[PDB]
Design a protein around this ligand. Structure first.
Ligand SMILES: Nc1ncnc2c1c(F)cn2[C@@H]1O[C@H](CO)[C@@H](O)[C@H]1O
Length: 327
């Protein structure tokens, strides 16, 4: 393992601002070579509860690391190519107590937004962490609930998500398995069209000024040459007992689809998550401009039709290739 200073030299550490969190740990934004990056920091291997949960072992965190790398590599592939995941710049195993400068950033977030996590000031100098440095992907869909222009934007977002998932199905037999709206990131782009390639066939998607990135592979699954990488949640209690959001139903619906066998490939789970995201677009997102005219009224009807028909498709690939929304 390396010290924190290896990943976060002084100037980079001084520029860290906290941008997100979960039971897993903390996410900070910083800058290096004039370029924003996001740093995800996860405590591993120790006996302390962290945010109410036991720390993962190295064996337990390896799947997320492997999947992050494979999905990032799709941006440079040829037959199955997409930029719709998030870039992975580096991964390190770090040993030490939590940097005081990161505690300062943590406190500022706690003071302004409020945190559900423990202040991470209780680690000893032998504590291990995984530090993942990602491309900065923008702002999550949940935080953009009231910030998007119109339902035309929602169409582009759904098309981008579906295309990225299809490409990862085709190349990696990928299932995200946790694509809640905190895991869909939006960034401005000046590109009018985005490009992907699916089984050697290239196409484009109108951007509506946004590029989508899918993040967070904690529950994900994929395979290469029959070697399956996944999170075995077959004995998890709490994952299947949530309430108050359709999100929590998706976990139960996945378990129904796969008969509680998480190593198998069931790309219908990607359809389920896409349905949950379409439902958010129609029910919880609110747009600056309503569908006040016809033509926008037509996009709205098409997204409603997608919502009521998409559960009859077998995979993101089937949706992309066959659904009328994308024709
Ligand atoms: N690569 C990234 N770029 C920008 N924001 C990010 C990330 C990332 F990995 C997490 N987050 C944020 O941290 C939260 C928890 O993972 C997410 O919901 C996002 O808000």
């Amino acid at each position: 393992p390396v010290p924190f200073s290896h990943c976060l030299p002084t100037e980079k550490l001084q520029r860290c601002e906290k941008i997100g969190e979960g039971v897993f740990g903390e996410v900070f934004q910083t800058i290096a070579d004039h370029t924003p990056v996001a740093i995800k920091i996860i405590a591993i291997e120790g006996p302390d509860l962290v945010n109410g949960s036991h720390q993962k072992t190295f064996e337990e965190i390896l799947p997320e690391i492997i999947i992050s790398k494979e999905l990032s590599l799709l941006s440079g592939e040829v037959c199955n190519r997409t930029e719709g995941f998030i870039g992975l710049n580096s991964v390190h195993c770090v040993q030490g107590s939590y940097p005081p400068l990161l505690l300062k950033a943590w406190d500022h977030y706690n003071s302004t937004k409020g945190s559900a996590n423990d202040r991470p000031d209780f680690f000893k100098d032998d504590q291990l962490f995984i530090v993942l440095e990602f491309e900065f992907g923008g702002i999550d869909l949940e935080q953009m609930r009231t910030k998007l222009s119109s339902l035309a934007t929602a169409k582009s977002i759904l098309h981008q998500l579906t295309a990225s998932l299809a490409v990862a199905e085709a190349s990696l037999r990928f299932e995200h398995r946790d694509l809640h709206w905190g895991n869909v990131l939006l960034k401005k782009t000046s590109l009018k069209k985005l490009h992907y390639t699916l089984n050697g066939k290239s196409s484009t998607i109108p951007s509506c000024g946004l590029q989508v990135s899918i993040i967070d592979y904690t529950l994900s699954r994929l395979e290469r040459d029959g070697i399956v990488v996944f999170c075995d949640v077959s004995m998890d209690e709490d994952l299947f007992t949530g309430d108050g959001d359709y999100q929590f139903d998706i976990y139960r619906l996945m378990k129904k689809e796969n008969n509680n066998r998480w190593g198998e490939y069931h790309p219908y789970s990607n359809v389920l998550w896409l349905h949950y995201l379409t439902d958010k677009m129609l029910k919880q997102m609110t747009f600056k401009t309503k569908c006040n005219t016809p033509a926008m009224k037509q996009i709205k009807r098409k997204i409603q039709e997608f919502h009521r028909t998409m559960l009859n498709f077998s995979s993101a690939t089937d949706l992309l290739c066959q659904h009328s929304l994308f024709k």
